[PDB]
């Protein structure tokens, strides 16, 4: 599968997502951004079935933006995640389920704390210090289980990912063409354009 990682540090949530889009025998694109900004302080990464992946992401994006305009307010990360879980939980028992896994990283302006939610296509939600979807978890959970600390700065967090990404580039069979990293904190969402060698 694709690489979808997430790590919640002291004051932020970092999301790393592979840039490759491979179909069969060919790597069609190497600069794919597997993420959608649901609200100024909530970001969602996703991986899974070819079409369901983006269709779902954009569908959720649309609904959150509609909520934002109707209420002129931004739903907390916890609320947005609960909405996404229910959407997937409905999906699993429908004619053709959305085969999509997601990581939702958002900064809760009311609590002033970063949050990381991991939700699979069955509608399984869990809040974590760090999460991953697919085969990545197999090499990154023990890594982080070792090098992770709650008080880490955003900078220590980026070093931590780099460590994950290196392990993934050594042992994973696929060439996922690097990752795109994004930071979610009290000031919104920004992208670390320099990870190709940080």
């Amino acid at each position: 599968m694709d690489i979808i990682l997430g790590i919640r540090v002291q004051d932020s949530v970092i999301l790393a997502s592979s840039k490759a889009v491979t179909r069969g025998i060919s790597v069609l694109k190497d600069s794919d951004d597997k993420t959608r900004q649901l609200s100024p302080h909530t970001l969602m990464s996703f991986a899974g079935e070819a079409g369901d992946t983006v269709q779902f992401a954009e569908y959720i994006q649309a609904n959150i933006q509609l909520y934002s305009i109707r209420e002129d307010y931004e739903l907390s990360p916890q609320a947005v995640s609960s909405f996404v879980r229910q959407e997937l939980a409905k999906s699993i028992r429908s004619r053709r389920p959305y085969q999509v896994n997601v990581l939702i990283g958002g900064y809760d302006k009311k609590k002033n704390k970063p949050e990381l939610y991991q939700i699979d296509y069955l509608g399984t939600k869990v809040e974590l210090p760090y999460g991953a979807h697919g085969y990545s978890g197999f090499y990154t959970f023990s890594l982080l289980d070792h090098h992770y600390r709650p008080d880490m700065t955003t900078e220590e967090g980026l070093d931590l990912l780099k460590l994950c990404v290196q392990e993934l580039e050594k042992r994973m069979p696929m060439d996922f063409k690097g990752v795109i990293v994004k930071i979610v904190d009290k000031d919104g969402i920004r992208q670390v354009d320099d990870f190709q060698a940080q």
Binding site: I25, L28, G51, Q55, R96
Partner: protein, 212 residues
């Protein structure tokens, strides 16, 4: 089938082969795999003949309605998404199509969108779609430069499809060329591989294997 489209300085090049098969049977060597959606929108076709022809012709009808309704030329992004969203509604039913929506709008400039029946929609500068895509990629990838001449780019495109027609048993017939500039697409002929191969061989010195 082999189809490609790539963005460069002089706009966009679009090249396709023209073979159609049903198993090992060569059903046609003269099929059009490029539909001119309109004066500035081209669509490439790969996969099931019927599925492509039908849905892309339908796409065109949808673009025309957009223009009558909004008094403005449909965007390459919006046009590609119409097809993508249609194809997604049918996901799982068996539609088979690998397509490329190429156009030029003042708002987007040269633009290329890959859209397949899996529901995948991707924006990019270079794409090769079809049973012969890998062959095209090999030639196109190793000679691409954003700074190619409208003359050279056209040739690479033409040469890339040739490569594919040669190695892919399911690609062949002739090469259909197109050049995209803001003033629309410019048809650049139908080159029969039957003659194009030997010409290129002699003049280029490649295909050194084959005996001539």
């Amino acid at each position: 089938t082999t189809t490609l489209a790539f963005r460069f300085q002089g706009g966009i090049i679009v090249a396709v082969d023209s073979r159609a098969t049903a198993g090992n049977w060569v059903a046609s060597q003269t099929v059009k795999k490029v539909i001119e959606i309109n004066p500035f929108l081209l669509g490439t076709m790969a996969g099931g003949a019927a599925d492509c022809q039908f849905w892309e012709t339908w796409l065109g009808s949808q673009c025309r309605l957009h223009e009558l309704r909004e008094k403005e030329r449909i965007s390459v992004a919006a046009a590609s998404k119409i097809l993508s969203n249609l194809v997604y509604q049918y996901k799982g039913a068996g539609l088979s199509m690998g397509t490329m929506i190429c156009g030029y709008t003042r708002k987007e400039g040269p633009t290329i969108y890959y859209v397949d029946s899996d529901g995948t929609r991707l924006k990019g500068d270079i794409f090769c779609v079809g049973s012969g895509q890998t062959f095209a990629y090999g030639v196109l990838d190793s000679n691409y430069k954003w700074d190619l001449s409208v003359e050279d780019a056209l040739y690479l495109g033409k040469r890339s499809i040739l490569a594919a027609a040669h190695r892919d048993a399911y690609s062949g017939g002739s090469v259909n060329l197109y050049h995209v500039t803001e003033d629309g697409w410019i048809y650049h002929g139908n080159h029969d591989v039957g003659e194009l191969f030997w010409k290129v061989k002699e003049e280029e010195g490649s295909f050194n294997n084959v005996i001539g």
